[PDB]
Ligand binder design. Structure first.
Ligand SMILES: Nc1ncnc2c1ncn2[C@@H]1O[C@H](COP(=O)(O)OP(=O)(O)O)[C@@H](O)[C@H]1O
Lengths: 109, 264
């Protein structure tokens, strides 16, 4: 009954704002210590790795079996679906159900 | 995990690795031939690299390119981890270099093209590869090379200090001197491999650790007389101490020596 809980499932933000996505592996002693982040931009078919650095940062909380991704200074280009994916300490594949991010406004302009 | 050992018939060993063996195998239902890499958990844990492997296997699972070895899946039992891999029937580039001593310009330029194509694809997926060694380049049925080392990174830049490899010979100066590194390591690797393919040994090879460290840090290398002007130009453009001065992958693929000699 292990599950990865990814939040928020849906996010609408304005340009310049920040988004934190959280993923928690619940209901299991298996450890989520190895999380990678992926994005498919809106309108695209290509999944990409979220490379850490610049506007993108990430944390791990080993004690709570969680991992987070923060994107700061959001841009319209950032619109898309985001997922955490990992192989946990039990060698089992884990993935969040995803965050559908829409960045609308507030100035293009 | 849904694949299991009973799904496979095992054949001859393909070779021995640090943490177990690799076997030829076929999946029983489809009779599809593949390679099964077996790793002992206790050995991975002993060396303390199991966590890193789980990160790398996850990354590898997304990479689909003719010049990148395909990972089809994985599974485990109480003592072992099993990686289901593309079978590369023509062995390693390392072994090919042992047999041929040196490669001609066509084979070299074609291999460099394949690597640059693979690395270009990697950039499009935003994954970074670290150093590339000939023993981790396998050959497909049509003689095309496949990057086989799972050596991927998702931090740009990175301050990481793996791998305690064999020698320093394939590491860029920023990695041995302890500075940050990113995608520009790619181009150093292409320069080292281009040289090694043409000459038969990598450009900074020496009898001692000390001398190799110094030659890499100083970018101290020379060419045998038979190396042509175009090859010298490409290699010298690639082996820059300052990573920011190394070319873009497109510039490698468009280099006159590459376009003149590559079959691809
Ligand atoms: N997918 C493959 N297809 C064909 N041969 C392989 C494959 N993977 C490994 N081998 C052979 O098995 C040997 C074990 O190598 P490898 O698995 O790379 O060990 P290590 O984990 O120590 O790097 C290699 O020398 C290579 O020749």
């Amino acid at each position: 009954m292990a599950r990865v809980d990814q939040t928020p499932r849906i996010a609408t933000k304005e340009t310049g704002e920040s988004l934190t996505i959280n993923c928690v592996l619940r209901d299991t002693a298996c450890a989520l210590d190895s999380t990678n982040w992926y994005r498919t931009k809106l309108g695209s078919t290509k999944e990409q790795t979220i490379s850490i650095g610049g506007r993108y940062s990430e944390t791990v909380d080993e004690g709570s079996n969680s991992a987070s991704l923060t994107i700061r200074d959001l841009r319209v280009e950032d619109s898309g679906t985001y997922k955490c994916k990992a192989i946990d300490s039990c060698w089992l594949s884990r993935e969040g159900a995803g965050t559908v991010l829409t960045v609308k406004g507030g100035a293009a302009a | 995990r849904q694949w299991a050992l009973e799904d496979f018939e095992i054949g001859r060993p393909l070779g021995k690795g640090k943490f177990g063996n690799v076997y030829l195998a076929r999946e029983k239902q489809s009779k599809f031939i593949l390679a099964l890499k077996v790793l002992f958990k206790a050995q991975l844990e002993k060396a303390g690299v199991e966590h890193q492997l789980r990160r790398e296997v996850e990354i590898q699972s997304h990479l689909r390119h003719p010049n990148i070895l395909r990972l089809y899946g994985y599974f485990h039992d109480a003592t072992r981890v099993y990686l289901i891999l593309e079978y590369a029937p023509l062995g390693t580039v390392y072994r090919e270099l042992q047999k041929l001593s040196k490669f001609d310009e066509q084979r070299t330029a074609t291999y460099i093209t394949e690597l640059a194509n693979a690395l270009s694809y990697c950039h499009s997926k935003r994954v970074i590869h670290r150093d590339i060694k000939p023993e981790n380049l396998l050959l497909g049925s049509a003689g095309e090379l496949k990057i086989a080392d799972f050596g991927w990174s998702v931090h740009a830049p990175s301050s990481r200090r793996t791998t305690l490899a064999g020698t320093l010979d394939y590491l860029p100066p920023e990695m041995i001197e302890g500075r940050m590194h990113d995608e520009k390591v790619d181009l150093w690797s292409l320069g080292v491999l281009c040289y090694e393919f043409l000459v038969g040994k990598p450009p900074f090879e020496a009898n001692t650790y000390q001398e190799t460290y110094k030659r890499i840090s100083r970018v101290e290398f020379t060419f045998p007389d038979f190396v042509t002007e175009g090859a010298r130009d490409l290699i010298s453009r690639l082996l820059k101490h300052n990573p920011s001065q190394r070319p873009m992958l497109r510039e490698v693929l468009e280099h006159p020596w590459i376009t003149a000699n590559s079959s691809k």
